[PDB]
Amino acid sequence: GTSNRDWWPNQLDLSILHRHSSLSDPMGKDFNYAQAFEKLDLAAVKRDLHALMTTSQDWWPADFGHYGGLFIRMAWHSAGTYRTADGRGGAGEGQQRFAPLNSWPDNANLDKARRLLWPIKQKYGRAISWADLLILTGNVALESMGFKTFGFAGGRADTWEPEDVYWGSEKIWLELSGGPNSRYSGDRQLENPLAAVQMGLIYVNPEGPDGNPDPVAAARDIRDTFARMAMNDEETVALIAGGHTFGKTHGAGPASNVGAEPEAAGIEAQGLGWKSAYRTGKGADAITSGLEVTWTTTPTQWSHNFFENLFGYEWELTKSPAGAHQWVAKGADAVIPDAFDPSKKHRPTMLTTDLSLRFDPAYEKISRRFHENPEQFADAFARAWFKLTHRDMGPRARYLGPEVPAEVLLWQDPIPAVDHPLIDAADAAELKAKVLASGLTVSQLVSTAWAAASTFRGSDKRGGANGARIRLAPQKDWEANQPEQLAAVLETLEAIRTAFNGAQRGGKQVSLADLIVLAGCAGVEQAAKNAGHAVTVPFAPGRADASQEQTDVESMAVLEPVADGFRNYLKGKYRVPAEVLLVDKAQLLTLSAPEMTVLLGGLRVLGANVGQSRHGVFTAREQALTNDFFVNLLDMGTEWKPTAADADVFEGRDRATGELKWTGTRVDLVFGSHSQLRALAEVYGSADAQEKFVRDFVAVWNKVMNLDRFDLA
Amino acid sequence: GTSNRDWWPNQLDLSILHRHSSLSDPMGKDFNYAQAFEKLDLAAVKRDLHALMTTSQDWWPADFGHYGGLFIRMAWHSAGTYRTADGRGGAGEGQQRFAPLNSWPDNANLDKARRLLWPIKQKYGRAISWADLLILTGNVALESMGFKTFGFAGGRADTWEPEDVYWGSEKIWLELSGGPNSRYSGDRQLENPLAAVQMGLIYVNPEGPDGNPDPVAAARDIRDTFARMAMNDEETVALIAGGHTFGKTHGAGPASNVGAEPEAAGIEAQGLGWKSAYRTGKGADAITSGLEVTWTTTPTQWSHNFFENLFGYEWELTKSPAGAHQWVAKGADAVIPDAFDPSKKHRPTMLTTDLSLRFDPAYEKISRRFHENPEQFADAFARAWFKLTHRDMGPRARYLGPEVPAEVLLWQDPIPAVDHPLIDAADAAELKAKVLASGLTVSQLVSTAWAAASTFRGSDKRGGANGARIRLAPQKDWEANQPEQLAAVLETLEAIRTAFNGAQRGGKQVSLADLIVLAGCAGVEQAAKNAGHAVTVPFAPGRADASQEQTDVESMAVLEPVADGFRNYLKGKYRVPAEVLLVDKAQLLTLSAPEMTVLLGGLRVLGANVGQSRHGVFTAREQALTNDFFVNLLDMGTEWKPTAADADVFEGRDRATGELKWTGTRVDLVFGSHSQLRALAEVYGSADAQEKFVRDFVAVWNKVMNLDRFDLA
Numbered sequence A, B: 001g002t003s004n005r006d007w008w009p010n011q012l013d014l015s016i017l018h019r020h021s022s023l024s025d026p027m028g029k030d031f032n033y034a035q036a037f038e039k040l041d042l043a044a045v046k047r048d049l050h051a052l053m054t055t056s057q058d059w060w061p062a063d064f065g066h067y068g069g070l071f072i073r074m075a076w077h078s079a080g081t082y083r084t085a086d087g088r089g090g091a092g093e094g095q096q097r098f099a100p101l102n103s104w105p106d107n108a109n110l111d112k113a114r115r116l117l118w119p120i121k122q123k124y125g126r127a128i129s130w131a132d133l134l135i136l137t138g139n140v141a142l143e144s145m146g147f148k149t150f151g152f153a154g155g156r157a158d159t160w161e162p163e164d165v166y167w168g169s170e171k172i173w174l175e176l177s178g179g180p181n182s183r184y185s186g187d188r189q190l191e192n193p194l195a196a197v198q199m200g201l202i203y204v205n206p207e208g209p210d211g212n213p214d215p216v217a218a219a220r221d222i223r224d225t226f227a228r229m230a231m232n233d234e235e236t237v238a239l240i241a242g243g244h245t246f247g248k249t250h251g252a253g254p255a256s257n258v259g260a261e262p263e264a265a266g267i268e269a270q271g272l273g274w275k276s277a278y279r280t281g282k283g284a285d286a287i288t289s290g291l292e293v294t295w296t297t298t299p300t301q302w303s304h305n306f307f308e309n310l311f312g313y314e315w316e317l318t319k320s321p322a323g324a325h326q327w328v329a330k331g332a333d334a335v336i337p338d339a340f341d342p343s344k345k346h347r348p349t350m351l352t353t354d355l356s357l358r359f360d361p362a363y364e365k366i367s368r369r370f371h372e373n374p375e376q377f378a379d380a381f382a383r384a385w386f387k388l389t390h391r392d393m394g395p396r397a398r399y400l401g402p403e404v405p406a407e408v409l410l411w412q413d414p415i416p417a418v419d420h421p422l423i424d425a426a427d428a429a430e431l432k433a434k435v436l437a438s439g440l441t442v443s444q445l446v447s448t449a450w451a452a453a454s455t456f457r458g459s460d461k462r463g464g465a466n467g468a469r470i471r472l473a474p475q476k477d478w479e480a481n482q483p484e485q486l487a488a489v490l491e492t493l494e495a496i497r498t499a500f501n502g503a504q505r506g507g508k509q510v511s512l513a514d515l516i517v518l519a520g521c522a523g524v525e526q527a528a529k530n531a532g533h534a535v536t537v538p539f540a541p542g543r544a545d546a547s548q549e550q551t552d553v554e555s556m557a558v559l560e561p562v563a564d565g566f567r568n569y570l571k572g573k574y575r576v577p578a579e580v581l582l583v584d585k586a587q588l589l590t591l592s593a594p595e596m597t598v599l600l601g602g603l604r605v606l607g608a609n610v611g612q613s614r615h616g617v618f619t620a621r622e623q624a625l626t627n628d629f630f631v632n633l634l635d636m637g638t639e640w641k642p643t644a645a646d647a648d649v650f651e652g653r654d655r656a657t658g659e660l661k662w663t664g665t666r667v668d669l670v671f672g673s674h675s676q677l678r679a680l681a682e683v684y685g686s687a688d689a690q691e692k693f694v695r696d697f698v699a700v701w702n703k704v705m706n707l708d709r710f711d712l713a
């Protein structure tokens, strides 16, 4: 069946903004996962998970009688898709049970692990999501084997279809670098937003870079990919050595024995894949990565034996039974146990990427301090495990259950508690009036609040207006935010805040975070008034101001907008058309196509553009909230041509006279070009639409202002 | 950007069940198009459309100063995508403004027509849909030019994204037959469900079959494609000669001058396409089809000149300026006016497909009767134009406004008026009790009401339980309906109905249509009781019984289910996997993925399978309404394998003992295989889900029973 994507493979794809509809969701409209989880008996679930660890099923027998290692791997993989560049991947949506992740080669035989969990999932039903259960299982694995974890938060609601994520352009699973769709260029520079070295791997190649078993060069890959998943050197050493304290790899025979991944397997496979023709196809004969390494003398118990081995032997290159490169300690006794035969033992073994922890000079320092001080290793690993598995959960307000750690961590972009009475409706009205009396314009009000609120992304639920981090490094210095205009608005707002708070009785005060947003609301109300309409923009107080010391500046860098079509802003020249980047921003902000359309047409006429650009400002009454953008865009009396000086800028001229009326970018004109977006624009540019335009604009403005407000959830 | 469709191009695609979500719809949840249209001043719209006809725009100047021909073509094309095989296409959703239809080659320059309508659309806004406006404009064109139309109904709501329709498999626009994705095989047999001879054409090639200018063979293609769009010989002749009484074709220079279709054109083209480099690119120089034919001496006025010319001249093969095959009148004077230059005239011309109306022997008889009796021509054309443009609108209850024809037409599958009081709640309870006392089983009651209600399709809104057409030819005879078991149920229900009606006062009575559905409801209630649940199934009376004479048996043939996963029924062997046919049926019934899942799991255990097959009946308490289908499907204690005798039938055996537990089809097992369907199945197969399964089942049961109930809308 030939489709529109076949005919027009470069058209903009809007279906990403309409995933996750009520149509696909089996739960009722009013189902609230937090409510369900808060009555889960978490202790009973954890007891059932404990029992499961040592209850072997014959269709996938447990190594050493204990599934603990398999489940640690599972939870690590659930979390380990995460990229800091866009916040996409991570454990927070349970995407490992859908395509493509369920069938990535690095997730081979995690299908077995998930199926081992069905009886527990079944038993507790909607009170525990798969997303939460994946992580909880990792935790109970670690606990069952003697490792103290740092804590656990529930609240990851299940999703019901695949997310649309750019995982790379390769058409070949695991393709080595340098092909026609290479994710590398220059001096081994990985393309953003990617965080893995080959298509279908979590981070790196365990044999080494593109299969070259050099621990030193492997370390370069490890560092780069881990940094792109928000982990520094210390956390990366702790995570890798911590993980590889447990279980084993699987490479008992040639990989050609392993059949179709789950999305390709026969219907009779009932959602499982990688069926193996090698001997029994499982247990002692299992093949997963094609390596055959067991790291420690007690693979079902926490120990410091990974570093004892790493440093205590000299290593020699060898091959697994499937032919992969790995390392053995030849001068060692056979001290490592066999997974199924009590009468066999084995020499210690390591991956190339394990030896990176010793032969990279920076890693060696850390690994040596962990070797000598295993208590520091255990603490680092517990912290990093928590960070790994919670990194995409959002503000701590979303964290549920009895095990949440009380310690507030800098990575969480923390927000101070609010300890005092909030402003009321009357107070809000008095502040709006003071804001409008100060002289701040509609353009400044709306620009400032947009700049503060629109850092939110739904992918990892970082960002938004709470915290007033717009006044802090680095947000205050971002080009998109217009640092000098910003600094002037903030100074005026701070003066109004100081006066209002100074005049209060009884502990009442307002945060700068709330006032920034309230000020934006008053600018929207004033713009409506300028168009001859009286409206109230909703406002919910409760935001708090975070300090510079509560703000990790490096972590904040990935939230800088380098493209924001809602402010007609592009920081440099990109390979990707600006309209594509617009839909990507809309998706991150959780907006539908209609909400993206109304929002951008209003921002245009409110003066939200960076630099006061005239591009897309299709109105003679700037700072009035009207549907002018749509009416003028859609007027056939105007003809559009690309400019000689810049093919991404267009002139709109009177078709008869030739006189210049407007200019716009691709972001502006796409609304008059793409057949679905133009149909939307038509609704808002019709004669009967002024009331609808205003009401829908205020609703999506409010939505944006509240994106991070899980305290009101 | 590699996607899931890339990796797994044969997996089942569920996105078709979740189009048209509230996310993509710019109108609020409660916007009601019928109510808006009801307040439109239709007379004022029609006056503005009359004015528009002769208000020529320079960017697409009007032929003969009158856009009437262009607009009749536009409306014709809007309606002319319709196929009776599935009810897909047609004018009823305004899909011409979306991909791919907006860019089909046969809709070349209809982009101009639609843009000429933006001012009107804008002025009346949401009170008139584009879908209605396209057809209304056609009608006004006809009226402006002197033709009395049969009538007009509004009520076609706009849609907001492309429909998923199979238009063929060819990867080349307009590909000739016999290619690698040929829509033809054998003795020029067109594959169902297709109703056009080449990819991107409406019906046939105007030059002749595969470009061979043979009027006789062209006629065969015309008859076959028109029959596949629900038109007989009389209606086809009337439509073609009626249409080609007006306007002209456009082929002033080589087709190579014409550029990108709308979905491929630069952003500056602002939604338009097929820009031409030939001379002015428009008007006298326009190129659309590449033919240059003008049929009559008065192309802006209704006349009897089409048939006068057709029969009054002998025809000679020639070429247009673009090189296409067409026909010119031997020895004729230059009597046809030029569209732009008062001092030019032209000899009469015809297309190959126009000559089919004279050289096909069957067509000739009709064309000659129209030639001799122009009043008969005019009336048949008016009737067929109304049918063409209303064919996918559904029951007459959907028809809005002051111009609806009062005449009831056989094609409408008409339903008699209800003239008497309806049964109330007391009466419904008394009938249900009599139904359950008669002996009819849960299986019989549920199967019969499913068979009556599940004929509905949302594509053209034909079918459903209203009318009790299940008791008439041909439905009573359809294999899927189990004709002998059907006849027995109907006899028992007709006896109950007779007795109930006989005992009433004051003209109260119950239709057989209502009783069939009410009986099904009682069987669902009885099933719930058998499972120990107290449930009440909603029921809305008001259906009426249609007669055999109100029921065109040939037209009804396209509604026979040859595949119905919901009854585990497949009539023969198809190229398309049965799970694909399942989702297609779900789409026609308007079901989401969750509703398809719940509905099929319940029907299985209620005994709805054709022939009482045990396939998918994963319960030990058949006829009890439970979630057993899901719980048992998902039990990992059971292993599934295809049977030796039939690879589409599977055996489920105890994994330990080897003992046979169940058998299933691909329709059954897809729910335990496809990663999104298995996620849905899991919700309904969890321990806390029995009540949710029952409540969701009853909701979708009720939905299906009411699909045709536009009298309640």
Ligand code: HEM
Pocket: A063, A068, A069, A070, A071, A072, A073, A076, A203, A204, A205, A206, A222, A239, A240, A242, A243, A244, A246, A247, A248, A249, A250, A251, A287, A288, A289, A290, A291, A353
């Ligand atoms: C450089 C980073 C990493 C590399 C290249 C890597 C590589 C591998 C490989 C190749 C396997 C064998 C899979 C199989 O054949 O069954 C494996 C197993 C394992 N990995 Fe990693 N790993 C890395 C990081 C981590 C981290 C961060 C964790 C957890 C914190 C983890 C925990 C484990 C566990 C527990 C297993 C054993 C699975 C079992 O017992 O079935 N790994 N690793």
Ligand code: HEM
Pocket: B063, B068, B069, B070, B071, B072, B073, B076, B203, B204, B205, B206, B222, B239, B240, B242, B243, B244, B246, B247, B248, B249, B250, B251, B287, B288, B289, B290, B291, B351, B353
């Ligand atoms: C066998 C079926 C038919 C064929 C092959 C056919 C073919 C054509 C072609 C090739 C054109 C020229 C398009 C152009 O270059 O602009 C055309 C024009 C037209 N057709 Fe048809 N046609 C068919 C049936 C119909 C029907 C059923 C109607 C309406 C009831 C219709 C009404 C018209 C009108 C009004 C025009 C003139 C457009 C104008 O003036 O711009 N045709 N037809």
Ligand SMILES: [C-]#N
Pocket: A073, A076, A202, A243
């Ligand atoms: C471990 N992967």
Ligand SMILES: [C-]#N
Pocket: B073, B076, B077, B243
């Ligand atoms: C006529 N198309």
Ligand SMILES: [Cl-]
Pocket: A088, A089, A090, A095, A163, A164, A165
């Ligand atoms: Cl994601």
Ligand SMILES: [Cl-]
Pocket: B088, B089, B090, B093, B095, B163, B165
């Ligand atoms: Cl359609």
Ligand code: NA
Pocket: A087, A088, A089, A090, A092, A392, A458, A459, A460
């Ligand atoms: Na994410």
Ligand code: NA
Pocket: B087, B088, B089, B090, B092, B392, B458, B459, B460
């Ligand atoms: Na249709």
